[PDB]
Amino acid sequence: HHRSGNLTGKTALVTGASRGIGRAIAEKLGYAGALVAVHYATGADAAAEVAESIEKDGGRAFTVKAELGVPGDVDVLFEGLERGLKERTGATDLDILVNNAGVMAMGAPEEVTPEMFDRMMAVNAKAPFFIVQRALSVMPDGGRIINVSSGLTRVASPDQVTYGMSKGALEQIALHFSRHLGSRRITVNSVAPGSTDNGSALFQIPEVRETLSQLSTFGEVAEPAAIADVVAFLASEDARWITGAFIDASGGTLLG
Amino acid sequence: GNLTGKTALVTGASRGIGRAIAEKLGYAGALVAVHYATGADAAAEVAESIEKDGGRAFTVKAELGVPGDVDVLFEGLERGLKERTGATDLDILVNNAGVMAMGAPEEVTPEMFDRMMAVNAKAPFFIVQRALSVMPDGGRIINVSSGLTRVASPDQVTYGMSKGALEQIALHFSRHLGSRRITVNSVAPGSTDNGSALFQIPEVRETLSQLSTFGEVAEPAAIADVVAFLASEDARWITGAFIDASGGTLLG
Amino acid sequence: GNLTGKTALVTGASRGIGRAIAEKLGYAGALVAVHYATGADAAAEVAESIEKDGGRAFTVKAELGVPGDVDVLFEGLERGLKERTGATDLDILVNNAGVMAMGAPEEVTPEMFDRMMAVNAKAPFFIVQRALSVMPDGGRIINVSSGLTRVASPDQVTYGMSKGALEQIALHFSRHLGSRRITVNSVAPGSTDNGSALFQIPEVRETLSQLSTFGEVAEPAAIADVVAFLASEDARWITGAFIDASGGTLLG
Amino acid sequence: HHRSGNLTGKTALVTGASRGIGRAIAEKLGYAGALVAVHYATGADAAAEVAESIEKDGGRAFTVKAELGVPGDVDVLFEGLERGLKERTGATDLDILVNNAGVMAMGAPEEVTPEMFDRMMAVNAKAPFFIVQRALSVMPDGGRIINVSSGLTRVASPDQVTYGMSKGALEQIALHFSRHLGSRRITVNSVAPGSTDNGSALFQIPEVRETLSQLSTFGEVAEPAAIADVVAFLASEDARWITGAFIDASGGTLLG
């Protein structure tokens, strides 16, 4: 059985869609009718469960494996993407791109090594750029690019400086590419979540779930669905006049 | 629609962007109060248009920027909402009504400045203040700003000032209203065809079209679609935010 | 000093930050007009203090936010400048005078709102407008804002709104005045000891000290030093800018 | 003969101080009395001429060679810096750090290679981070860190996206380090020049000196001295209440 919505007929790639925010994004886009390529690095069982969840709810989805931040990453990602799309649609067209996959590594600024710096930049900033560069060859007019940033680009947090740097680089993609792609009517935007419960063990550290909840003006951490809802909107026809924007989905974390 | 059971006030809803907002909120299930100053026939067209497509709407007259304005507005609003729903509850507030008066800054009189500030900043503040007594948890406040708070134009400086004051409402009330889960946000359209004869003059249309990265002026619906999303459950985690709905006008 | 041969108006110069600004501009060589509302004895102390250290200064009385305010100000200013220099040329304008009135937003009256807007936004706009007729090329306009335009505080919302309007002056007039090489900029102090008895209450001082990343409230001189730089030749390539002089208050 | 000013007794490092903006920064800081370490990669003759110019005007300066963006770069930079400082002052203390050195490589977004990306990031963002990390061990309280960004982080320019990304990363240093260093009273700020005539050949392309001049509200490109004057201010006692700030020295380029 197939369910129809505002994205029926469209195709989407959500990077790191096996858990947390990316999972909720994929589910929401699939629910809306988009054929969703559910990307992962090593969590294939989690990805399959997301893809199945979409398919069971009457949507369409498949999984693609790609380790990002290593040589040949984009090549591997697009080989699997295009194959799955061509198989299911008879074409390689990609309408919606969500750059969600990312890494974090807390620590004192004095302990950051060049290797740690390289990894952060490689996964959070370089890969999103080259994924965008590659998607342009297969993205039709009226397409969508959404990059998942962080409110940590607007709040000083010494233990997260490397991560903030990476996301501040990522935010520059929306600015410069929105102008580049204007005549093709492809919108490029950044969405900045605040603290969001991704399920991970480090959110179940009892000295962490506190203070994080105090960041938001609402006094809670976000559910991933709250962020997914914003991304789904940006991917839609209703967000056609928004491009090159920084979209604050932090639940009032950026209030100073 | 996702706004079934909700109520909404859209100020300046008789024409232009406010009309599109009211029409889009009605379609989604909200009982819309269509506000106007002197466009009585126009407001009634919008209210009828909402009812026609299966929704519920009514009109409320209030000239803003003069003493007792908010009193008049909320007298008409609460009376109409109670007659229709049995409560004075206001879920959604859109501060859309506004004036513009372009001209050299050397020529701005104090009275022009008072008028600009009275309608674009003061009234929205006192409208928000009065709405707090009737707005349930999970409510929505949306203030229509302008890209001109980020793009320098000497001819529009007092307009800019008024909208910069308006934008402060979202910042400060978001913190105030956090524990009631009422979101407060600013929306900034770019150049938008409001139906006025101005946007039909080919040479004015061409200059304005060039401001957006798309090479077009916006249709009102494009702005309404953004406001409709902010009013919804889907934007529960967006508060105190500046939302750029300018179609790439603010790219420098 | 680097301001020798220059003239300067500092509004609200009888006390606090404006006093420090006037004292620092005088020391650098500017003929300073020390403006006040009712602090006549205080203004005279500042003017004397400038002359004592080898500079030139005088006082100008004007209650702002009431009709004819700018007329009174510029009558006194241009008369005093002409008597002292032989011209009415005004090189440096600092819009520093301001009021604050903290309190719950539910309790803001329209008259409180008018007062706030009249003194903090309207007067600075009409002061800039009148200054344009007497300001030579290479001139300077500096508007004292506040970190509260970037930090949400319900108790300060109308203050915030007024300062958000003020900040629009720099954006739009910078473009207007580009070909005259007159720079227009906003400066935002953080919590600053203005000499008032408020900053002596230990528990108020402690709370305010915590806002800065330095754990201290600012001395007025720290703000004046920033304004002094903007007024100088060294800041010729800074226009239309928001200058954060808050000591790390705006770090989120 | 020695000239005295507001920075007498202080020491400064200006990266890429052999030409353009860095040269003007060094001259201005030296003129103010700071002992200036004039850094360069391959332009040793230009650096010596800057260091001599400062010394002739009654200041103190020496040159340090270091290629940034390659392994061991920071090690090499600090070996030469500390040696020169210890020789001249008897201590390794560094009061003022200016991260000025940087690269640019225009081009269509579709032509950017990973190697081009790596180089941009390595020189403009990574090296500034590790230079800051290393300077902290030798920077006394009341110190200064100034990073030279660009107005290109606020103006969309498709041909410069990689460069914008690098500078957007660089701007995150000021935000996170200002909070980290608050109790040590070290200020960390970003300064964003607009178009500035650095002398380079690419500024003498006649199809380039046009349009660039139109960026500023003043209708000219900046002289390097105009930017240096802003940096000198930030390095001074008068800028003690400014930290974590983005300082717009673009001559009204950011007006939209």
Ligand SMILES: NC(=O)c1ccc[n+]([C@@H]2O[C@H](COP(=O)([O-])OP(=O)(O)OC[C@H]3O[C@@H](n4cnc5c(N)ncnc54)[C@H](OP(=O)(O)O)[C@@H]3O)[C@@H](O)[C@H]2O)c1
């Ligand atoms: N959580 C927050 O509070 C929060 C706040 C603001 C912003 N964000 C951002 O939101 C995005 C997702 O956050 P999250 O908390 O949901 O993350 P998450 O739970 O840790 O999951 C990260 C996702 O990225 C994938 N991934 C990680 N490294 C990868 C790599 N090298 N190559 C390919 N895929 C990789 C993971 O795949 P596998 O299953 O194979 O490991 C997973 O699907 C990130 O960009 C994060 O920066 C999160």
Ligand SMILES: NC(=O)c1ccc[n+]([C@@H]2O[C@H](COP(=O)([O-])OP(=O)(O)OC[C@H]3O[C@@H](n4cnc5c(N)ncnc54)[C@H](OP(=O)(O)O)[C@@H]3O)[C@@H](O)[C@H]2O)c1
């Ligand atoms: N159009 C654009 O390009 C554009 C761009 C950016 C932002 N905006 C902003 O978006 C909002 C609407 O713009 P627009 O072009 O659609 O409006 P436009 O047609 O003037 O429509 C104005 C609406 O506001 C009402 N109004 C005006 N003054 C009023 C007053 N003093 N008291 C009560 N109502 C008053 C008018 O009522 P009546 O019909 O009774 O006179 C009308 O409904 C404004 O805030 C404007 O600043 C517009």
Ligand SMILES: NC(=O)c1ccc[n+]([C@@H]2O[C@H](COP(=O)([O-])OP(=O)(O)OC[C@H]3O[C@@H](n4cnc5c(N)ncnc54)[C@H](OP(=O)(O)O)[C@@H]3O)[C@@H](O)[C@H]2O)c1
């Ligand atoms: N202090 C802070 O923590 C702080 C922080 C951020 C921003 N600011 C801003 O910096 C500026 C000065 O602050 P402050 O604390 O130093 O001032 P504070 O002592 O009140 O001093 C006010 C000054 O402005 C004058 N003034 C007030 N109302 C006036 C009016 N209606 N017409 C003409 N003059 C009037 C006063 O004149 P008289 O002596 O004649 O009454 C006095 O000279 C203000 O714009 C304020 O918003 C202050």
Ligand SMILES: NC(=O)c1ccc[n+]([C@@H]2O[C@H](COP(=O)([O-])OP(=O)(O)OC[C@H]3O[C@@H](n4cnc5c(N)ncnc54)[C@H](OP(=O)(O)O)[C@@H]3O)[C@@H](O)[C@H]2O)c1
């Ligand atoms: N020019 C503009 O309009 C403009 C506008 C905004 C921002 N900026 C920024 O201002 C800063 C300086 O600009 P500029 O135009 O003066 O640059 P410039 O004339 O090209 O000189 C660059 C300086 O950086 C050094 N350098 C380059 N690569 C290096 C490396 N890999 N390792 C160590 N040093 C290296 C050069 O040393 P050598 O002499 O040995 O080659 C030189 O001293 C840059 O960060 C640039 O991004 C410039």
Ligand SMILES: Cc1cc(O)c2c(c1)CC(=O)C1=C2C(=O)c2cccc(O)c2C1=O
């Ligand atoms: C273990 C851990 C440490 C953190 O420092 C954060 C988180 C986890 C969640 C997260 O990624 C974030 C923050 C965060 O403060 C923080 C502070 C201010 C804004 C914001 O978005 C964040 C944020 O997203």
Ligand SMILES: Cc1cc(O)c2c(c1)CC(=O)C1=C2C(=O)c2cccc(O)c2C1=O
């Ligand atoms: C007659 C007239 C003059 C204007 O100056 C505008 C308009 C009409 C339409 C309008 O309201 C706007 C602009 C506008 O430039 C302009 C410039 C930059 C941003 C922006 O939103 C606008 C804008 O919304």
Ligand SMILES: Cc1cc(O)c2c(c1)CC(=O)C1=C2C(=O)c2cccc(O)c2C1=O
């Ligand atoms: C009684 C009183 C209440 C205040 O709320 C402030 C002050 C006094 C001093 C003051 O003017 C300021 C603040 C302030 O928080 C505050 C919060 C965040 C930024 C900021 O600049 C300020 C600020 O300048």
Ligand SMILES: Cc1cc(O)c2c(c1)CC(=O)C1=C2C(=O)c2cccc(O)c2C1=O
């Ligand atoms: C060859 C060349 C191309 C450029 O694109 C720029 C420059 C040289 C000088 C430069 O680095 C800059 C810009 C620039 O537009 C530009 C546009 C808007 C702001 C800004 O700072 C710049 C800018 O600094």
